[PDB]
Amino acid sequence: GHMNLTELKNTPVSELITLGENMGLENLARMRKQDIIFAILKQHAKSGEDIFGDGVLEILQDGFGFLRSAAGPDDIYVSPSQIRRFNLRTGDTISGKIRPPKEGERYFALLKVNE
Ligand SMILES: [Cu+2]
């Protein structure tokens, strides 16, 4: 539980490269900051550990939502069933356990609200 995507984005890149290289992640030094972060989370998620995220909900016309930073690629996807089961509304500030995209998916996704 100490890795939170919002906190990682606010961490200086030199500390991110150190963490990543310590995890055995090879040459993060050519990557953009956002990509180093993703790389770390994906690798860390393979151990079964919880990882967290947070943002401001916006519900789109199809019924799913994103948690926005209060830039797209790190917006967190929120399914229709989660919005309706937990009564989440546009503009709520949400925190929860997230998961990396699996194959076919493009965005990190909310796993559990309210953690
Ligand atoms: Cu942790």
UniProtKB/Swiss-Prot annotation:
Keywords: ATP-binding, Helicase, Hydrolase, Nucleotide-binding, RNA-binding, Transcription, Transcription regulation, Transcription termination. One of its GO terms (molecular function) is ATP hydrolysis activity. The keyword Transcription regulation applies. GO terms for cellular component: cytosol. Residues 63-68, 75-77, 105-107 are annotated as: RNA-binding 1. GO terms for biological process: DNA-templated transcription termination. Residues 50-115 form the Rho RNA-BD domain. Facilitates transcription termination by a mechanism that involves Rho binding to the nascent RNA, activation of Rho's RNA-dependent ATPase activity, and release of the mRNA from the DNA template. Belongs to the Rho family. Homohexamer. The homohexamer assembles into an open ring structure. This is Transcription termination factor Rho. It comes from Escherichia coli O157:H7.
